[PDB]
Amino acid sequence: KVFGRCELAAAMKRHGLDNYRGYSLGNWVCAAKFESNFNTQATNRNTDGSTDYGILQINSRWWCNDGRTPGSRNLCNIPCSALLSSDITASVNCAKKIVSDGNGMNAWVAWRNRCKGTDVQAWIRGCRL
Numbered sequence: 001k002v003f004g005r006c007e008l009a010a011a012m013k014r015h016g017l018d019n020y021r022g023y024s025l026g027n028w029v030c031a032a033k034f035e036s037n038f039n040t041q042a043t044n045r046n047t048d049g050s051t052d053y054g055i056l057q058i059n060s061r062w063w064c065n066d067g068r069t070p071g072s073r074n075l076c077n078i079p080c081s082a083l084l085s086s087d088i089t090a091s092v093n094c095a096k097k098i099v100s101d102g103n104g105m106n107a108w109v110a111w112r113n114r115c116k117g118t119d120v121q122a123w124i125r126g127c128r129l
């Protein structure tokens with residue numbers, strides 16, 4: 001599924017991400033825009049052989065099982081395919097674990113390089129929330 005900006009803001013708000021670990025909803029929408037262009041089916045292979053899955057590009061080295069990342073963990077206890085669903089529940093639930101892990105939203109490279117310290121409120125401007 002390719003979400004609309006406001007549609008995804010609403011979905012993320014409903015799943016408890018607004019101000020989760022102190023990050024406002026615009027941070028999560030910005031991260032999704034630059035990681036996946038709001039496409040739940042996005043995948044990207046890493047040089048190390050791990051793969052990033054779904055709207056928040058969650059990596060198989062730590063967070064999900066794809067059966068082809070040797071020596072990896074599955075800290076979210078999910079198949080990585082669950083992260084590609086039109087239903088963002090599994091992505092959101094795993095993102096809450098990640099953002100709790102110690103480096104906050106710096107875990108997301110696109111967030112650090114393209115969202116951090118910008119006017120992220122612009123990402124939810126005009127949305128009925």
Ligand SMILES: [Cl-]
Pocket residue numbers: 005033
């Ligand atoms: Cl947009």
Ligand SMILES: [Cl-]
Pocket residue numbers: 024025026027120121122124
């Ligand atoms: Cl915001």
Ligand SMILES: [Cl-]
Pocket residue numbers: 065066067068069070071072
């Ligand atoms: Cl594996």
Ligand SMILES: [Cl-]
Pocket residue numbers: 072073074075
């Ligand atoms: Cl594990």
Ligand SMILES: [Cl-]
Pocket residue numbers: 065078079080
């Ligand atoms: Cl699995």
Ligand SMILES: [Cl-]
Pocket residue numbers: 011086087088089
């Ligand atoms: Cl959803």
Ligand SMILES: [Cl-]
Pocket residue numbers: 021022103104105
């Ligand atoms: Cl933090």
Ligand code: NA
Pocket residue numbers: 060061062063064065066069072073074
């Ligand atoms: Na894994």
